[PDB]
Write a protein that holds these residues in place. Structure first.
Motif, PDB file in Angstrom:
ATOM      1  N   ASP A 193      55.432 -11.921  85.561  1.00  0.00           N
ATOM      2  CA  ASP A 193      55.402 -12.804  84.408  1.00  0.00           C
ATOM      3  C   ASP A 193      55.227 -14.251  84.865  1.00  0.00           C
ATOM      4  OD1 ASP A 193      58.062 -12.161  85.522  1.00  0.00           O
ATOM      5  OD2 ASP A 193      58.790 -13.557  83.925  1.00  0.00           O
ATOM      6  N   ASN A 194      54.167 -14.874  84.388  1.00  0.00           N
ATOM      7  CA  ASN A 194      53.742 -16.225  84.744  1.00  0.00           C
ATOM      8  C   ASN A 194      53.307 -16.357  86.196  1.00  0.00           C
ATOM      9  OD1 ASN A 194      54.436 -17.093  81.995  1.00  0.00           O
ATOM     10  ND2 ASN A 194      56.559 -17.091  82.733  1.00  0.00           N
ATOM     11  N   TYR A 195      53.043 -15.251  86.886  1.00  0.00           N
ATOM     12  CA  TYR A 195      52.562 -15.349  88.253  1.00  0.00           C
ATOM     13  C   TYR A 195      51.160 -15.955  88.274  1.00  0.00           C
ATOM     14  CZ  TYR A 195      51.814 -14.290  93.123  1.00  0.00           C
ATOM     15  OH  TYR A 195      51.548 -14.388  94.472  1.00  0.00           O
ATOM     16  N   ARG A 196      50.991 -16.997  89.080  1.00  0.00           N
ATOM     17  CA  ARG A 196      49.748 -17.767  89.110  1.00  0.00           C
ATOM     18  C   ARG A 196      49.406 -18.331  87.736  1.00  0.00           C
ATOM     19  N   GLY A 197      50.431 -18.501  86.905  1.00  0.00           N
ATOM     20  CA  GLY A 197      50.245 -19.063  85.593  1.00  0.00           C
ATOM     21  C   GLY A 197      49.831 -18.076  84.513  1.00  0.00           C
ATOM     22  N   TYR A 198      49.743 -16.784  84.827  1.00  0.00           N
ATOM     23  CA  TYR A 198      49.323 -15.779  83.847  1.00  0.00           C
ATOM     24  C   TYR A 198      50.535 -15.141  83.181  1.00  0.00           C
ATOM     25  CZ  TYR A 198      44.603 -16.303  85.574  1.00  0.00           C
ATOM     26  OH  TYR A 198      43.333 -16.735  85.856  1.00  0.00           O
ATOM     27  N   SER A 199      50.671 -15.374  81.879  1.00  0.00           N
ATOM     28  CA  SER A 199      51.823 -14.859  81.155  1.00  0.00           C
ATOM     29  C   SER A 199      51.808 -13.333  81.142  1.00  0.00           C
ATOM     30  CB  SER A 199      51.767 -15.368  79.741  1.00  0.00           C
ATOM     31  OG  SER A 199      50.637 -14.803  79.086  1.00  0.00           O
ATOM     32  N   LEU A 200      52.985 -12.777  80.869  1.00  0.00           N
ATOM     33  CA  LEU A 200      53.164 -11.334  80.911  1.00  0.00           C
ATOM     34  C   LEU A 200      52.154 -10.587  80.031  1.00  0.00           C
ATOM     35  CD1 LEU A 200      54.908  -9.147  82.159  1.00  0.00           C
ATOM     36  CD2 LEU A 200      56.554  -9.487  80.231  1.00  0.00           C
ATOM     37  N   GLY A 201      51.839 -11.116  78.844  1.00  0.00           N
ATOM     38  CA  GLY A 201      50.902 -10.435  77.944  1.00  0.00           C
ATOM     39  C   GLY A 201      49.526 -10.278  78.584  1.00  0.00           C
TER      40      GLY A 201
ATOM     41  N   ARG B 204      38.645 -10.021  81.764  1.00  0.00           N
ATOM     42  CA  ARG B 204      37.720 -11.057  81.342  1.00  0.00           C
ATOM     43  C   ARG B 204      37.063 -10.678  80.014  1.00  0.00           C
ATOM     44  NH1 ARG B 204      32.451 -11.900  81.717  1.00  0.00           N
ATOM     45  NH2 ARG B 204      32.031 -10.180  83.153  1.00  0.00           N
ATOM     46  N   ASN B 205      36.643  -9.428  79.860  1.00  0.00           N
ATOM     47  CA  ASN B 205      35.870  -9.054  78.687  1.00  0.00           C
ATOM     48  C   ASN B 205      36.699  -8.686  77.478  1.00  0.00           C
ATOM     49  OD1 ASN B 205      33.389  -9.446  79.915  1.00  0.00           O
ATOM     50  ND2 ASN B 205      33.341  -7.356  80.779  1.00  0.00           N
ATOM     51  N   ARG B 206      37.972  -8.365  77.659  1.00  0.00           N
ATOM     52  CA  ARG B 206      38.766  -7.857  76.556  1.00  0.00           C
ATOM     53  C   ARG B 206      40.087  -8.576  76.313  1.00  0.00           C
ATOM     54  NH1 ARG B 206      38.155  -1.365  76.964  1.00  0.00           N
ATOM     55  NH2 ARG B 206      38.695  -1.506  74.758  1.00  0.00           N
ATOM     56  N   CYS B 207      40.578  -9.361  77.239  1.00  0.00           N
ATOM     57  CA  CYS B 207      41.862 -10.025  77.128  1.00  0.00           C
ATOM     58  C   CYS B 207      41.742 -11.542  77.130  1.00  0.00           C
ATOM     59  CB  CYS B 207      42.769  -9.622  78.296  1.00  0.00           C
ATOM     60  SG  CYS B 207      43.097  -7.858  78.357  1.00  0.00           S
ATOM     61  N   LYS B 208      40.928 -12.093  78.025  1.00  0.00           N
ATOM     62  CA  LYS B 208      40.789 -13.532  78.200  1.00  0.00           C
ATOM     63  C   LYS B 208      40.515 -14.176  76.855  1.00  0.00           C
ATOM     64  CE  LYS B 208      38.188 -16.751  81.078  1.00  0.00           C
ATOM     65  NZ  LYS B 208      37.112 -16.833  82.126  1.00  0.00           N
ATOM     66  N   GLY B 209      41.285 -15.189  76.552  1.00  0.00           N
ATOM     67  CA  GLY B 209      41.120 -15.966  75.357  1.00  0.00           C
ATOM     68  C   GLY B 209      41.696 -15.371  74.089  1.00  0.00           C
ATOM     69  N   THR B 210      42.172 -14.145  74.107  1.00  0.00           N
ATOM     70  CA  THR B 210      42.695 -13.470  72.940  1.00  0.00           C
ATOM     71  C   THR B 210      44.204 -13.733  72.823  1.00  0.00           C
ATOM     72  OG1 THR B 210      43.329 -11.371  73.989  1.00  0.00           O
ATOM     73  CG2 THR B 210      40.992 -11.632  73.349  1.00  0.00           C
ATOM     74  N   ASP B 211      44.783 -13.257  71.725  1.00  0.00           N
ATOM     75  CA  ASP B 211      46.227 -13.406  71.484  1.00  0.00           C
ATOM     76  C   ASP B 211      47.007 -12.398  72.333  1.00  0.00           C
ATOM     77  OD1 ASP B 211      48.782 -13.841  70.480  1.00  0.00           O
ATOM     78  OD2 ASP B 211      48.402 -12.843  68.570  1.00  0.00           O
ATOM     79  N   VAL B 212      47.080 -12.702  73.624  1.00  0.00           N
ATOM     80  CA  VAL B 212      47.670 -11.737  74.549  1.00  0.00           C
ATOM     81  C   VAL B 212      49.175 -11.592  74.355  1.00  0.00           C
ATOM     82  CG1 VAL B 212      45.852 -11.979  76.300  1.00  0.00           C
ATOM     83  CG2 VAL B 212      47.880 -13.442  76.358  1.00  0.00           C
TER      84      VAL B 212
ATOM     85  N   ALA C 187      50.564 -10.732  71.754  1.00  0.00           N
ATOM     86  CA  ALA C 187      50.775  -9.533  70.956  1.00  0.00           C
ATOM     87  C   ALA C 187      51.181  -8.355  71.835  1.00  0.00           C
ATOM     88  CB  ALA C 187      49.510  -9.182  70.205  1.00  0.00           C
ATOM     89  N   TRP C 188      50.759  -8.330  73.118  1.00  0.00           N
ATOM     90  CA  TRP C 188      51.074  -7.180  73.982  1.00  0.00           C
ATOM     91  C   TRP C 188      52.534  -7.107  74.371  1.00  0.00           C
ATOM     92  CZ3 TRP C 188      47.847  -3.357  74.024  1.00  0.00           C
ATOM     93  CH2 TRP C 188      46.521  -3.640  73.652  1.00  0.00           C
ATOM     94  N   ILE C 189      53.285  -8.196  74.224  1.00  0.00           N
ATOM     95  CA  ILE C 189      54.705  -8.171  74.517  1.00  0.00           C
ATOM     96  C   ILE C 189      55.544  -8.314  73.245  1.00  0.00           C
ATOM     97  CG2 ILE C 189      54.365  -8.843  76.898  1.00  0.00           C
ATOM     98  CD1 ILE C 189      55.493 -11.643  76.143  1.00  0.00           C
ATOM     99  N   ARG C 190      54.907  -8.369  72.075  1.00  0.00           N
ATOM    100  CA  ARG C 190      55.609  -8.624  70.825  1.00  0.00           C
ATOM    101  C   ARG C 190      56.601  -7.508  70.589  1.00  0.00           C
ATOM    102  N   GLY C 191      57.796  -7.884  70.182  1.00  0.00           N
ATOM    103  CA  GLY C 191      58.853  -6.950  69.901  1.00  0.00           C
ATOM    104  C   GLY C 191      59.581  -6.406  71.105  1.00  0.00           C
ATOM    105  N   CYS C 192      59.103  -6.642  72.299  1.00  0.00           N
ATOM    106  CA  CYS C 192      59.738  -6.020  73.435  1.00  0.00           C
ATOM    107  C   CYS C 192      61.027  -6.721  73.860  1.00  0.00           C
ATOM    108  CB  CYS C 192      58.787  -6.067  74.620  1.00  0.00           C
ATOM    109  SG  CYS C 192      57.155  -5.290  74.369  1.00  0.00           S
ATOM    110  N   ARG C 193      62.015  -5.919  74.246  1.00  0.00           N
ATOM    111  CA  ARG C 193      63.278  -6.445  74.747  1.00  0.00           C
ATOM    112  C   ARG C 193      63.012  -6.833  76.185  1.00  0.00           C
ATOM    113  NH1 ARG C 193      67.323  -3.115  72.120  1.00  0.00           N
ATOM    114  NH2 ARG C 193      66.363  -1.464  73.388  1.00  0.00           N
ATOM    115  N   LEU C 194      62.925  -8.131  76.444  1.00  0.00           N
ATOM    116  CA  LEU C 194      62.555  -8.614  77.771  1.00  0.00           C
ATOM    117  C   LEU C 194      63.516  -9.697  78.243  1.00  0.00           C
ATOM    118  CD1 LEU C 194      58.696  -8.828  77.271  1.00  0.00           C
ATOM    119  CD2 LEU C 194      59.918  -7.224  78.761  1.00  0.00           C
TER     120      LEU C 194
END
Ligand SMILES: [Cl-]
Ligand SMILES: [Cl-]
Ligand SMILES: [Cl-]
Ligand SMILES: [Cl-]
Ligand SMILES: [Cl-]
Ligand code: NA
Length: 129
Positions: free
Chosen positions: A18-26, A112-120, A122-129
């Protein structure tokens, strides 16, 4: 192993992605969704004769040894089979090296083709983290 979405998010966080190299968990969860559908045992052969392995589809051309990719390197210093285990440690540690390599998460074509720039997030929404 086929992870659930929130289950994988939790494991990735435990392993420091999570946030490794600035990339959030989603970002990482989205990449795994589209690379492997969360299946640690996923393998896919590439046209060049290399093979992608595991939840993040890491390629034997550079990153792991499979014994059948001529001229390739093994920069994560692991057998590619290590990338198929139900424990994601080896895939996470290798992904950390990849994402540090210069092009960030663009190394993962599905990212790059399916995640970059999207509302990523959402992939962690609701998760107990
Ligand atoms: Cl899902
Ligand atoms: Cl996120
Ligand atoms: Cl090889
Ligand atoms: Cl794990
Ligand atoms: Cl970056
Ligand atoms: Na290799």
């Amino acid at each position: 192993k086929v992870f659930g979405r929130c289950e994988l998010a939790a494991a990735m966080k435990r392993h420091g992605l999570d946030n490794y190299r600035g990339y959030s968990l989603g970002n990482w969860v989205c990449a795994a969704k589209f690379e492997s559908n969360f299946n640690t045992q996923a393998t896919n052969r590439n046209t060049d004769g290399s093979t992608d392995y595991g939840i993040l589809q890491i390629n034997s051309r550079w990153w792991c040894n499979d014994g059948r990719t001529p001229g390739s390197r093994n920069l994560c210093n692991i057998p590619c089979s290590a990338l198929l285990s139900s424990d994601i440690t080896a895939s996470v540690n290798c992904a950390k090296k990849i994402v540090s390599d210069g092009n960030g998460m663009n190394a993962w074509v599905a990212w790059r083709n399916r995640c970059k720039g999207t509302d990523v997030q959402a992939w962690i929404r609701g998760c107990r983290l």
